[PDB]
Design an enzyme around this catalytic site. Structure first.
Site, mmCIF file in Angstrom:
data_model
loop_
_atom_site.group_PDB
_atom_site.id
_atom_site.type_symbol
_atom_site.label_atom_id
_atom_site.label_comp_id
_atom_site.label_asym_id
_atom_site.label_seq_id
_atom_site.Cartn_x
_atom_site.Cartn_y
_atom_site.Cartn_z
ATOM 1 N N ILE A 91 0.849 -1.181 0.000
ATOM 2 C CA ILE A 91 0.000 0.000 0.000
ATOM 3 C C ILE A 91 0.886 1.233 0.000
ATOM 4 O O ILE A 91 2.003 1.223 0.526
ATOM 5 C CB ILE A 91 -0.960 -0.008 1.201
ATOM 6 C CG1 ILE A 91 -2.013 -1.088 1.014
ATOM 7 C CG2 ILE A 91 -1.666 1.319 1.309
ATOM 8 C CD1 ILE A 91 -3.083 -0.691 0.028
ATOM 9 N N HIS A 108 -6.337 -4.929 -11.144
ATOM 10 C CA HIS A 108 -6.929 -5.654 -10.051
ATOM 11 C C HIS A 108 -7.789 -6.794 -10.573
ATOM 12 O O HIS A 108 -8.542 -6.605 -11.528
ATOM 13 C CB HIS A 108 -7.792 -4.726 -9.203
ATOM 14 C CG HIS A 108 -8.196 -5.319 -7.900
ATOM 15 N ND1 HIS A 108 -9.496 -5.664 -7.616
ATOM 16 C CD2 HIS A 108 -7.471 -5.636 -6.805
ATOM 17 C CE1 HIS A 108 -9.556 -6.169 -6.398
ATOM 18 N NE2 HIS A 108 -8.341 -6.162 -5.885
ATOM 19 N N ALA A 140 -6.166 6.105 -6.819
ATOM 20 C CA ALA A 140 -6.463 7.143 -5.848
ATOM 21 C C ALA A 140 -6.152 6.621 -4.448
ATOM 22 O O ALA A 140 -5.818 5.451 -4.261
ATOM 23 C CB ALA A 140 -7.920 7.588 -5.950
ATOM 24 N N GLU A 141 -6.258 7.504 -3.454
ATOM 25 C CA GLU A 141 -5.833 7.129 -2.108
ATOM 26 C C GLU A 141 -6.682 5.981 -1.570
ATOM 27 O O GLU A 141 -6.160 4.922 -1.199
ATOM 28 C CB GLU A 141 -5.880 8.342 -1.177
ATOM 29 C CG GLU A 141 -5.229 8.083 0.180
ATOM 30 C CD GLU A 141 -4.856 9.353 0.928
ATOM 31 O OE1 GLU A 141 -4.739 10.418 0.287
ATOM 32 O OE2 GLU A 141 -4.672 9.283 2.163
ATOM 33 N N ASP A 142 -8.000 6.178 -1.520
ATOM 34 C CA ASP A 142 -8.920 5.105 -1.162
ATOM 35 C C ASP A 142 -9.061 4.129 -2.322
ATOM 36 O O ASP A 142 -9.414 4.521 -3.437
ATOM 37 C CB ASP A 142 -10.296 5.669 -0.808
ATOM 38 C CG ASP A 142 -10.276 6.548 0.424
ATOM 39 O OD1 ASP A 142 -9.684 6.138 1.444
ATOM 40 O OD2 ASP A 142 -10.862 7.648 0.367
ATOM 41 N N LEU A 171 -5.691 -13.829 -18.367
ATOM 42 C CA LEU A 171 -5.681 -13.634 -19.809
ATOM 43 C C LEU A 171 -6.378 -12.338 -20.198
ATOM 44 O O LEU A 171 -6.057 -11.751 -21.232
ATOM 45 C CB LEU A 171 -6.321 -14.834 -20.509
ATOM 46 C CG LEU A 171 -5.448 -16.083 -20.573
ATOM 47 C CD1 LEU A 171 -6.034 -17.029 -21.548
ATOM 48 C CD2 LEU A 171 -4.044 -15.746 -20.982
HETATM 49 N N1 LIG Z 1 -2.815 3.876 -1.634
HETATM 50 C C1 LIG Z 1 -3.053 2.771 -2.514
HETATM 51 N N2 LIG Z 1 -2.100 1.876 -2.679
HETATM 52 C C2 LIG Z 1 -2.294 0.834 -3.499
HETATM 53 C C3 LIG Z 1 -1.493 -0.257 -3.875
HETATM 54 C C4 LIG Z 1 -2.260 -1.003 -4.755
HETATM 55 N N3 LIG Z 1 -3.437 -0.429 -4.916
HETATM 56 C C5 LIG Z 1 -4.491 -0.963 -5.779
HETATM 57 C C6 LIG Z 1 -5.517 -1.764 -4.950
HETATM 58 C C7 LIG Z 1 -5.272 -3.289 -4.852
HETATM 59 C C8 LIG Z 1 -4.658 -3.749 -3.508
HETATM 60 C C9 LIG Z 1 -5.457 -4.167 -2.454
HETATM 61 C C10 LIG Z 1 -4.866 -4.583 -1.267
HETATM 62 C C11 LIG Z 1 -3.490 -4.605 -1.133
HETATM 63 C C12 LIG Z 1 -2.872 -5.041 0.196
HETATM 64 O O1 LIG Z 1 -3.467 -5.796 0.872
HETATM 65 N N4 LIG Z 1 -1.592 -4.481 0.646
HETATM 66 C C13 LIG Z 1 -1.038 -4.898 1.943
HETATM 67 C C14 LIG Z 1 -0.658 -6.373 1.869
HETATM 68 C C15 LIG Z 1 0.857 -6.586 1.854
HETATM 69 C C16 LIG Z 1 1.131 -8.059 2.134
HETATM 70 O O2 LIG Z 1 0.194 -8.895 2.012
HETATM 71 O O3 LIG Z 1 2.281 -8.422 2.490
HETATM 72 C C17 LIG Z 1 0.155 -4.063 2.450
HETATM 73 O O4 LIG Z 1 0.722 -3.194 1.745
HETATM 74 O O5 LIG Z 1 0.573 -4.246 3.618
HETATM 75 C C18 LIG Z 1 -2.686 -4.200 -2.173
HETATM 76 C C19 LIG Z 1 -3.274 -3.772 -3.353
HETATM 77 C C20 LIG Z 1 -3.492 0.690 -4.173
HETATM 78 C C21 LIG Z 1 -4.473 1.678 -3.954
HETATM 79 O O6 LIG Z 1 -5.710 1.605 -4.593
HETATM 80 N N5 LIG Z 1 -4.217 2.689 -3.132
HETATM 81 N N1 LIG Z 2 -3.842 -6.651 -5.037
HETATM 82 C C1 LIG Z 2 -3.157 -6.577 -6.311
HETATM 83 C C2 LIG Z 2 -3.222 -7.921 -6.984
HETATM 84 O O1 LIG Z 2 -3.716 -8.893 -6.421
HETATM 85 N N2 LIG Z 2 -2.702 -7.989 -8.201
HETATM 86 C C3 LIG Z 2 -2.874 -9.208 -8.933
HETATM 87 O O2 LIG Z 2 -1.649 -9.962 -8.860
HETATM 88 C C4 LIG Z 2 -1.407 -10.648 -10.105
HETATM 89 C C5 LIG Z 2 -0.071 -10.255 -10.691
HETATM 90 O O3 LIG Z 2 0.476 -11.385 -11.376
HETATM 91 P P1 LIG Z 2 1.888 -11.285 -12.133
HETATM 92 O O4 LIG Z 2 2.888 -11.381 -10.998
HETATM 93 O O5 LIG Z 2 1.781 -12.460 -13.082
HETATM 94 O O6 LIG Z 2 1.949 -9.951 -12.821
HETATM 95 C C6 LIG Z 2 -2.587 -10.315 -11.031
HETATM 96 O O7 LIG Z 2 -3.502 -11.401 -11.048
HETATM 97 C C7 LIG Z 2 -3.215 -9.055 -10.425
HETATM 98 O O8 LIG Z 2 -4.599 -8.955 -10.647
#
Ligand SMILES: Nc1nc2ccn(CCCc3ccc(C(=O)N[C@@H](CCC(=O)O)C(=O)O)cc3)c2c(=O)[nH]1
Ligand SMILES: NCC(=O)N[C@@H]1O[C@H](COP(=O)([O-])[O-])[C@@H](O)[C@H]1O
Length: 200
Positions: A91, A108, A140-142, A171
């Site tokens: 994050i 995602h 975005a942030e959220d 795919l």
């Molecule tokens: N600010 C902001 N940052 C990001 C980064 C990606 N995205 C896109 C959203 C997809 C997503 C949803 C959840 C998690 C997550 O769970 N991260 C944890 C786990 C780490 C662990 O599992 O080790 C952590 O960082 O600790 C990551 C990505 C955004 C976003 O939309 N906003």
């Molecule tokens: N929360 C973000 C997340 O889950 N991302 C997901 O991780 C995979 C990346 O695979 P890759 O290592 O083959 O690119 C993808 O399935 C993507 O949707």
């Protein structure tokens, strides 16, 4: 437009983006790949295509903002215009996200708003939907404020596991992510003044 791709794992999307940005009509170029986890499979694909790589162990920084700084430093070093999260698992801090408002994309594995968060495919199978998909949005942030650029739907076959459903979804990700990149980089889709996605 100069793009940086941030990975954490296998890098199959990174490869998807690498293949499309090498196409002659591409409006993007991948000048730097940055991972937060070492010895990951996506680093060798970056090297195989002659793309510079940088590893930034998030585990070594006091907080997020000091970790994002190290990232934003490399991004500035390579004069990056667009940031691609493709399997990135960290994050990001508020400032780091505000700086790149309109300039950062994420892929995602779900039809947002549904199944937000990390384990999308797990939730989708517990809920038992007949249709899932992937979403490419602006970061975005959220995680639920990001404006949605492209989506593509994927079916959920009976008896699916995360190992099989996620394989099918990828795919699509390998389709809409290179496309959504091409939209943003060519200056076709742009985050509008009102914050909603503005076509052109
Ligand atoms: N600010 C902001 N940052 C990001 C980064 C990606 N995205 C896109 C959203 C997809 C997503 C949803 C959840 C998690 C997550 O769970 N991260 C944890 C786990 C780490 C662990 O599992 O080790 C952590 O960082 O600790 C990551 C990505 C955004 C976003 O939309 N906003
Ligand atoms: N929360 C973000 C997340 O889950 N991302 C997901 O991780 C995979 C990346 O695979 P890759 O290592 O083959 O690119 C993808 O399935 C993507 O949707």
């Amino acid at each position: 437009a100069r793009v940086a791709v941030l990975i954490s794992g296998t890098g199959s999307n990174l490869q998807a983006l690498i293949d499309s940005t090498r196409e002659p009509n591409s409006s993007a170029q991948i000048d730097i790949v940055i991972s937060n986890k070492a010895a990951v499979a996506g680093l060798d694909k970056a090297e195989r295509a002659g793309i510079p790589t940088r590893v930034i162990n998030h585990k070594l920084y006091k907080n997020r903002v000091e970790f994002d700084s190290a990232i934003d430093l490399v991004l500035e070093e390579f004069s990056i215009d667009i940031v691609c999260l493709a399997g990135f698992m960290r994050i990001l801090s508020g400032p780091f996200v505000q700086k790149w408002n309109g300039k950062m994309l994420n892929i995602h594995p779900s039809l947002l708003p549904s199944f937000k968060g990390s384990n999308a495919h797990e939730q989708a199978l517990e809920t038992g939907v007949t249709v899932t998909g992937c979403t490419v949005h602006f970061v975005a942030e959220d995680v639920d404020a990001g404006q949605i650029i492209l989506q593509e739907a994927v079916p959920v076959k009976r008896g699916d596991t995360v190992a099989t459903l996620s394989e099918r979804v990828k795919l699509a990700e390998h389709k809409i992510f290179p496309a959504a990149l091409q939209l943003v980089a060519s200056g076709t889709v742009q985050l509008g003044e009102n914050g909603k996605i503005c076509w052109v």
